[PDB]
Amino acid sequence: SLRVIDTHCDALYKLQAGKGKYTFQDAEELDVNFERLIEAKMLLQGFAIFLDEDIPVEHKWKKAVEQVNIFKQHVLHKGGIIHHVKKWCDLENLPEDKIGAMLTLEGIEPIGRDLDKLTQLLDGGVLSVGLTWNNANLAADGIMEERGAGLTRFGKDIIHLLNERKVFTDVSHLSVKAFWETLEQAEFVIASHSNAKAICSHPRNLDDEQIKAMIEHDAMIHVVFYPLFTTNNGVADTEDVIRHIDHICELGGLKNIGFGSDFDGIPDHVKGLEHVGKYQSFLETLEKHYTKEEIEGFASRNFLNHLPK
Numbered sequence: 001s002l003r004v005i006d007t008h009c010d011a012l013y014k015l016q017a018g019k020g021k022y023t024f025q026d027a028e029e030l031d032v033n034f035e036r037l038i039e040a041k042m043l044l045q046g047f048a049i050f051l052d053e054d055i056p057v058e059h060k061w062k063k064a065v066e067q068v069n070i071f072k073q074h075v076l077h078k079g080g081i082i083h084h085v086k087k088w089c090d091l092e093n094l095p096e097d098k099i100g101a102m103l104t105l106e107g108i109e110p111i112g113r114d115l116d117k118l119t120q121l122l123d124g125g126v127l128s129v130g131l132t133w134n135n136a137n138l139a140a141d142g143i144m145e146e147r148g149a150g151l152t153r154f155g156k157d158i159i160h161l162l163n164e165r166k167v168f169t170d171v172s173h174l175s176v177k178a179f180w181e182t183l184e185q186a187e188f189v190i191a192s193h194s195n196a197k198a199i200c201s202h203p204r205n206l207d208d209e210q211i212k213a214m215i216e217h218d219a220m221i222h223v224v225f226y227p228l229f230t231t232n233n234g235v236a237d238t239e240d241v242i243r244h245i246d247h248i249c250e251l252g253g254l255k256n257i258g259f260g261s262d263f264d265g266i267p268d269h270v271k272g273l274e275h276v277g278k279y280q281s282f283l284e285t286l287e288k289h290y291t292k293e294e295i296e297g298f299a300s301r302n303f304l305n306h307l308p309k
């Protein structure tokens with residue numbers, strides 16, 4: 001078996017929505033739960049902070065802080081084993097009996113116009129920040145906004161702070177224009193959950209030009225287990241996920257590929273990747289296609305080679 005790094009799940013959004021109905025220990029309805037993370041042999045799971053687009057502007061910060069509190073109270077020190085990775089040394093020094101968990105921020109909506117709110121989140125240990133979800137916000141346009149604009153000054157100022165703090169700038173969800181501008185501005189670039197658009201043409205995916213640029217930037221691309229972004233017909237299994245891995249390798253990105261499941265953030269599943277406990281069976285499926293060294297690259301080593309430094 002091999003340890004796993006997965007950059008993106010929406011367990012916090014789901015736990016929050018559940019209103020106490022879900023036990024993180026073992027709830028079957030949670031794609032990511034304690035028992036399943038153990039089964040996965042998880043090394044590091046990214047937990048996104050994300051609010052429904054319908055949480056009003058005046059409550060977004062409160063609800064985000066609530067998610068951070070859910071993380072601290074119900075995820076963290078689960079089994080004593082879940083260990084909060086708040087800085088990159090925490091991961092590099094992680095005890096072998098621990099499973100690392102980091103916070104990431106999916107769109108800067110919760111900070112309003114206040115950079116100090118972002119500072120608070122970074123101090124709290126957020127290690128990757130997506131400037132946008134799908135919508136227009138004060139930092140940039142996300143991919144679903146028809147205007148498709150790039151970065152605002154605020155967006156640029158945010159990226160500068162991220163660079164300074166050795167935090168990833170996450171391009172998943174950005175408009176095409178914001179993507180290109182972000183590559184010029186950001187020092188530590190990741191796509192925490194995006195697939196290849198040549199293989200599945202959803203606008204949420206990255207085209208060949210974008211993928212080549214990511215590689216040139218020495219960025220990480222973390223493939224996502226959502227059938228809608230995996231196959232054009234919307235029905236997908238693990239071999240279909242591998243077609244994206246193949247494609248990125250073909251574009252020169254063997255060492256730039258990781259996993260970003262989007263577990264708990266998706267209405268249906270890739271067959272064979274129904275929940276995070278399926279990870280080990282998926283890695284063995286990979287053995288028909290790639291060497292153990294290459295698979296270890298996808299599972300953890302690529303990400304580990306790209307920590308902000």
Ligand SMILES: CC(C)C[C@H](N)P(=O)(O)C[C@H](C)C(=O)O
Nearest residue numbers: 010013050106204226262265266
């Ligand atoms: C919690 C649900 C509603 C939204 C998630 N934050 P998502 O990560 O945006 C899932 C989606 C398919 C995507 O990645 O585009």
Ligand SMILES: [Zn+2]
Nearest residue numbers: 010048106265
């Ligand atoms: Zn998410």
Ligand SMILES: [Zn+2]
Nearest residue numbers: 106173193265
């Ligand atoms: Zn998302």
